[PDB]
Amino acid sequence: KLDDLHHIAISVTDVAQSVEWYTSHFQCRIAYQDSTWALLKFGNLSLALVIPEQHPPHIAFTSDRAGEYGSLKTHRDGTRSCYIQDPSGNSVELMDPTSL
Template sequence: MRHSMTDTTSKTKLAAIDHVAIPVTDVESSVKWYTSQFNCNIEYQDDTWAFLAFENIKLALVVTHQHPPHLAFVSPHAESYGQLKTHRDGSRSIYIKDPAGNAVEIVAEDSVPKNGG
């Protein structure tokens, strides 16, 4: 089956994965486990999700009734996918679904902190 190339002129190919979000039942205990087992830093944490920064990627630990498990890409043209939402951490993004129904987050490049900053 061929896939149509509609609306590709306004969207760029995404080269960077920003983070992967996995479901957890308890954010605090999951953060403790990941930070004790692996070399990572806590970038953000509350009762419903946490961001852990590794050298090459971020891991989001999410409570699924608040946040969907997903794969997130950074895009300089995220708004071309639809209206962006501003999140508590200051990032702006939109969630879309792939053909299999998996959640994919498109994060605005200008709302993602640069490494070391």
């Protein structure tokens, strides 16, 4: 039972400009969008386009042991996750599968 990626947040310089580009190149759906970040649903996961000042980039995994690495925070959408960094300084989020 391999852990899954849940979503990847990459830095962009202009959210509307990015959403225009990704949706014209890729078969995807705009799940959420304002002026500081956007979320694009793909078939196997979702891609957040983020202004790093407003929403830092990161990669999120599901983990049965997310709690063992940090205290789970509850988000407005009802899911639970915590953040850590890998040895390089990359932001890694561990989603609580039970909160999905």
